[PDB]
Amino acid sequence: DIDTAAKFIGAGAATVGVAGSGAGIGTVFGSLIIGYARNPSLKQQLFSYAILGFALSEAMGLFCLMVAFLILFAM
Amino acid sequence: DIDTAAKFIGAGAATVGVAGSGAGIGTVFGSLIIGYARNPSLKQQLFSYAILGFALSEAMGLFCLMVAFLILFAM
Amino acid sequence: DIDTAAKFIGAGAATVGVAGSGAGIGTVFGSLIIGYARNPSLKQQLFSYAILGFALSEAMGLFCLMVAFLILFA
Amino acid sequence: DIDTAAKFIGAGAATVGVAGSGAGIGTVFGSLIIGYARNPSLKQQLFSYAILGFALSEAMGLFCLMVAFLILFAM
Amino acid sequence: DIDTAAKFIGAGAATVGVAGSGAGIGTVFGSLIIGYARNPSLKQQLFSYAILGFALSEAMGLFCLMVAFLILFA
Amino acid sequence: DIDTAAKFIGAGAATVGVAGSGAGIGTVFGSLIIGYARNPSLKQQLFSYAILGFALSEAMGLFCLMVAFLILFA
Amino acid sequence: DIDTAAKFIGAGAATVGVAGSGAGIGTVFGSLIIGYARNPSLKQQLFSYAILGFALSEAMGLFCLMVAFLILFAM
Amino acid sequence: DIDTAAKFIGAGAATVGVAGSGAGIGTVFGSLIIGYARNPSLKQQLFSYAILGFALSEAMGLFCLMVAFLILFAM
Amino acid sequence: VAYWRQAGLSYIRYSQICAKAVRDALKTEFKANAMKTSGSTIKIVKV
Amino acid sequence: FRSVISYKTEEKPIFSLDTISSAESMSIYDDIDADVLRNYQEYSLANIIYYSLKE
Amino acid sequence: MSFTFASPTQVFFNSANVRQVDVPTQTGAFGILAAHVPTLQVLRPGLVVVHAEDGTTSKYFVSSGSVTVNADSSVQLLAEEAVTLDMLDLGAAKANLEKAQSELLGAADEATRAEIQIRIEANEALVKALE
């Protein structure tokens, strides 16, 4: 069914959002490596903020992915 | 059915864009991490303007997402 | 329609460019965080720089979406 | 018809390229913030090089917009 | 069937997501180089957190991969 | 036929994802340069982590190209 | 004319690739900013290297740009 | 025929992977700049690495370009 | 390479001038012990 | 000086910028541009001289 | 962290333990905690607000010197002129800043210009310190 072809095309096109999340998270944890290296005795605070940033980047990532998934099955 | 498919395709091509804002969010939060590693005495200011950068990039992410939904549902 | 379906495709495609503007904005503000945690004795000038950069990059992403919304209905 | 459809597709996939220029200017101004924070004794030279970077980066970005514009208006 | 062609199109488009994980790994390992150069005496824990980040970016890469084959091979 | 066109689309899209792996190689190597300038007395370990990061980025790139060559020729 | 459609769509897809050129020129200019600030003494050599990177990415952008130009003129 | 256009559509989609190559080259030739600015006494080794990275990333860029031109002319 | 370095002023000159400045901002209530313990006295004899 | 009756002669080392910015020993120290060593040594010279003067 | 903050005349902290330090430097201020990466930064006219292990944080103005963050987590903060804040006249600091600017032009040489700029910068950092 052509509409199902659109379904598949749109899902595959909009699952690319994970790209930005991957790049941003890579940057985040690299900065975490640097920051903990410079000042090792703030490792706990640095990882608190690192987990904040991780969660709140993957949040938008999987938000887009979940919107596209609802597009996929249960529109 | 051609326009029905084009709507979902354009919706995907619009929901992709927020990946860049996700990368920017990762950048700014890693920047918070290392800036707090260097100068922990500015915790308050650092966090308060890191969250501002977060919301400010969320602005552009919402910008693309709303564009996508507008095209998909209301032309 | 063929032509209108392509209109929609072109709009959705054009409105992707915003990714670069958003990432660049994130870079500008992370850099403000860094350069301010370093030297907090120029706060005013640092905010001047960062806001000017935000306006600039946001504006360029908005030009991309301007192409999107003019191809939409023009 | 497909000529007009081709024009719309081309504009949509062409005006994209300015995202790279956006990332470029973001990096340029981040390095500007860093460079100023280092040596406020060079502010004028920093401004000169930064506006030069903006000019010679938005110039790079604008070509995809110009290509789409030429395709649309005058084919 | 044509819908299988659509599956191919979607999977090809999805496979672009791999780029995010690739760039993330690049920058994470670059920051590990930096953090092992500036402060060699944290090598251990720095590498631990670097592999953590590698895992959580390969997460995006592999989830894009798996979804590409799920839409292609549901 | 339409599946041939779908396979062409599959190649054209799936290969793009390698941009992230290329950029990650670029960033990890720039980090090599920075670290080596900072701590020249670790040259060997710098190459070690450099080749490690390159392998872990070519993983993603070769997944991209494998998906391309499997949609197209298989 | 599906031939013209392919020409224009291909040109529009090729011109995007200069996103890498934009990001590269931006990061090179920012790197030059940082380098001049930290070590103003080697201004000349750093600027020469920056121009070299500028051009060496502009050529890679011109690759796709000339592909599009050739499509526009010949094919 | 559609496939006489699908070949070029796929090739134009393929060529865009060169954005990663461009961004990587710019990043490496900015790292060159700042690395030389910080520690001028290690210039030759810096440049020896820089060429390695440039060649090694434009290699993947040329893999993308070769895929494209193989679709175009050699098959 | 701050501005005073290319001027030729050795870092000791810079520290001297900054210290003198921070001394001039001292209250005359404390300028008593600031002025003493501050001045240099050594003269130089050449070869 | 050690006690009202006790003083022991001592000799302490002064290192130049070339000697100090070309040793693997202090590679670890971070943020050290080739200039901040010039300033730090210019200051440590006066610092050691003042210490010796007081003693 | 074994902190030792001293001046040519007086010693404030001798192998004392304080949690966090906020030092200025020639490349923009920063902070120091127990295991901070070793550094050989020099100082800039500014103020160090040492954070005692407990709540108290004490602010000492310093005019120049050298901060060394040690390999074994200790710290040596030597300052040519380490004065606690109250000993300074903010009005006199601003007046000195203004005068020093006044003689800014009267610098037939570049080195003289740098001299007046040095005093001006120190005076302004003082002015901001006392607020």
Numbering used by the authors:
A (entry chain R), B (entry chain Q), D (entry chain O), G (entry chain N), H (entry chain M): 1 to 75
C (entry chain P), E (entry chain K), F (entry chain L): 1 to 74
I (entry chain I): 1 to 47
J (entry chain G): 165 to 219
K (entry chain H): 16 to 146
What did the authors write?
The dimeric enzyme, inhibited by residues 1 to 60 of regulatory protein IF1, was purified in the presence glycodiosgenin, Brij-35, and phospholipids, and its structure was determined by cryo-EM of single particles. The inhibition of ATP hydrolysis in the isolated catalytic F1-domain arrests the rotary cycle at the catalytic dwell, and in structures of the inhibited bovine F1-IF1 complex, the rotary cycle has been arrested at 27° to 32° after the pause in the rotary cycle preceding the release of phosphate. In the current structure, the postphosphate release angles are 28.8°, 26.2°, and 25.5° in states 1 to 3, respectively. Therefore, the rotational angle in the F1-domain is not influenced significantly by interactions with the additional components of the intact enzyme that are absent from the isolated F1-domain. The PS is an essential component of the enzyme’s stator linking the α3β3-sphere of the F1-catalytic domain to the membrane-associated wedge and the adjacent a-subunit into the stator subcomplex against which the rotor turns. During catalysis, it prevents the dissociation of the α3β3-domain from the central stalk by clamping it in position from above, and it resists the rotational torque of the central stalk, preventing the α3β3-domain and the rest of the stator domain from following the direction of rotation. A cap provided by the N-terminal domain of the OSCP is linked to the N-terminal extensions of the three α-subunits and adjusts its connections in concert with the rocking of the α3β3-domain during a catalytic cycle.
Mitochondrial ATP synthases occupy the inner membranes of the organelle and form dimers via specific interactions in their membrane domains. Each monomeric unit in the dimeric bovine enzyme described here is an assembly of 28 polypeptide chains of 17 different kinds, organized into a spherical catalytic globular domain that extends from the inner mitochondrial membrane (IMM) into the mitochondrial matrix, attached to an intrinsic membrane domain by a central stalk and a peripheral stalk (PS). This membrane-bound enzyme is a machine that transmits by a rotary action the potential energy of the transmembrane proton motive force, generated by respiration, into the catalytic sites in the extrinsic domain.
